[PDB]
C-alpha cells in the first residue's frame, strides 16, 4: 500500500543466475505498471510471470539444491504477501482466476464474522470457520501451482515425530493464507480437499538447506478417487507426497 509492495522480490545475496535476475526485473516493471492498470490485472500478471519462470527456467536448474529450495521458500512467501496486499483492495466477495498454466487462485474478501465458509477450486478446497481469518474485511486465499519440479527437486522430507525416503509429490503446491500473520496456531482446525493425487500418503508443507517437506501435525483423514482430505491446524504451502521408504 506504501508503494513498496514489490521491493521484497530481490535475489538473495550469493546467487548469480541470468533467469532469476530477468524475472525480478520483470516483476519490478510489473510494480511500475501496477499503479495504472488494475489490482485485478497486476495479480494476473504476477501469476503469469511466476508461470513463465517455472515453465522455462534457465540456469536456475543449474543452481545448487539448497539455493533452489531457498528460492522456492522466498517465492512462496512473496506470493502470499503480494496476494494479501492486492486482495486488500478488491471488491467484497469471491475472486477466482485460472492461469493458462492451470495456476488456480481463489480469494474470499468479506466482513468479519463467525460463519462457516466453504471455498476453493478444482485443485484445492477449504472448509474453515470465518472466526480464524479475521484475526477491515478478512481475506482467505488458495494459490495452487501445479508444476513446481525444478525448484522443489531433491528436497528432503522430515517428519519430526518418527531411513531412506523416495519423495514424489502427488498434488499441486497449494499455498493457503489469511489476513492475520500468525498462521501456525489457528483456533479451529481447517479441512482441506486437494486433488490430482493417486508406501504412504502424507499431507506435508514446505517448511523453511533452506527448505524441506515437513508434516508437523496435519492429520490425513483419508484418500479416495484421486483426492486426499487433510485436517490441518496451520497454514502453509501444502502438497500431498508419497513416502516410499
Amino acid at each position: 500500500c506504501e508503494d513498496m509492495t514489490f521491493s521484497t522480490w530481490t535475489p538473495p545475496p550469493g546467487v548469480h543466475s541470468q533467469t532469476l535476475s530477468r524475472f525480478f526485473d520483470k516483476v519490478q516493471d510489473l510494480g511500475r505498471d501496477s499503479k495504472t492498470s488494475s489490482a485485478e490485472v497486476t495479480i494476473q500478471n504476477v501469476i503469469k510471470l511466476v508461470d513463465e519462470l517455472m515453465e522455462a527456467p534457465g540456469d536456475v536448474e543449474a543452481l545448487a539444491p539448497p539455493v533452489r529450495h531457498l528460492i522456492a521458500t522466498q517465492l512462496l512467501s512473496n506470493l502470499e504477501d503480494i496476494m494479501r496486499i492486492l486482495a486488500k483492495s478488491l471488491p467484497k466477495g469471491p475472486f477466482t482466476y485460472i492461469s493458462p498454466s492451470n495456476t488456480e487462485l481463489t480469494l474470499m474478501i468479506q466482513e468479519r464474522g463467525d460463519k462457516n465458509v466453504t471455498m476453493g477450486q478444482s485443485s484445492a478446497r477449504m472448509k474453515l470457520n470465518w472466526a480464524v481469518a479475521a484475526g477491515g474485511p478478512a481475506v482467505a486465499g488458495i494459490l495452487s501451482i501445479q508444476n513446481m519440479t525444478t525448484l522443489l527437486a531433491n528436497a528432503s522430507l522430515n517428519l519430526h515425530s518418527k531411513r531412506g525416503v523416495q519423495l514424489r509429490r502427488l498434488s499441486a503446491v497449494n499455498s493457503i493464507f489469511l489476513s492475520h500473520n500468525n498462521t501456525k496456531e489457528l483456533n479451529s482446525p481447517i479441512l482441506f480437499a486437494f486433488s490430482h493425487l493417486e508406501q504412504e500418503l502424507l499431507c506435508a508443507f514446505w517448511k523453511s538447506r533452506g527448505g524441506h517437506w515437513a508434516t508437523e501435525g496435519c492429520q490425513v483423514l483419508g484418500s479416495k478417487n484421486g483426492s486426499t482430505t487433510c485436517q490441518c491446524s496451520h497454514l502453509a504451502s501444502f502438497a500431498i507426497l508419497m513416502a516410499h521408504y
Partner: antibody
Amino acid sequence: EVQLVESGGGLVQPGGSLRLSCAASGFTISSYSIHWVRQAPGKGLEWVASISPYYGSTSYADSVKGRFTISADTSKNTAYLQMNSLRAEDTAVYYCARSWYYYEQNPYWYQKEEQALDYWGQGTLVTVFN
Amino acid sequence: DIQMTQSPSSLSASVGDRVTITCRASQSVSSAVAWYQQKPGKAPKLLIYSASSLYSGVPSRFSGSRSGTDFTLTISSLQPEDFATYYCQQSVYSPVTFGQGTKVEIK
C-alpha cells in the same frame, strides 16, 4: 450411455387422469433416486415427487401429495408418475432426473444424505385444457 | 420449507466479464446447494454440487462458495455459450427447493 426418456404426457381435461413414464437406460435405477421436476411455461423449476426404489421412500410435494402417485418397476427399469385429479395449475413440462448421492466420492468431506440431479431427462409436456 | 432467494434474477454481461450470482437461503443448509444451467427449450444440466465441487465435464471457469447461508456461483471469464438461466437447489430438507432463477444476457 445414460439416457432418460419420458412419455405419456399430452392433453387432458381438468379432473382427469394421466400417467407419465420415464424409461431409464445405461444404468440400474436400483441405486439412485428418480426425482420428478416440473417447469410451468415461462416459470422456474419446481419439485413434484421423488422415489428410491430400493427403499421405497415415497416423497411428494405439498400441492401434489393428495393425488400424484410415483412408482418404479425394477423389472422394466422405468419410473412412473400416476397424476390424477389434474387442475389447470398442473400444465408444465415434467422432467425426470437421477438423484446422485455423492457421499461415497469423499466420505470425509461430504455428508451422508447429500444428493444432486446429475442426469436429467428431456421433459414431457402436460396440457390441462378446459 | 427453505426459501431459496436469488439475485439479481437478471444479469447483462459481456464476454470475459466475471459474473457472480448469489443464492442466499433461509434457515441453514450447511453446504448441500447445487447449481444448474438451463438454456431455453432444453433440460437443465448440473454444474456445481456441494456448493464448491465441479461436476464432471463442466468448464473450470465455474466456481462456487458458501459464506454461512449465502451461496455464490462465479464465472471467471464469460463465454458466448454461458448465457442461460441458473438455478440453485437444496435437498437437505424436504421439500427440495429451487432458486427463482438468474438469467444472463449478452450486453
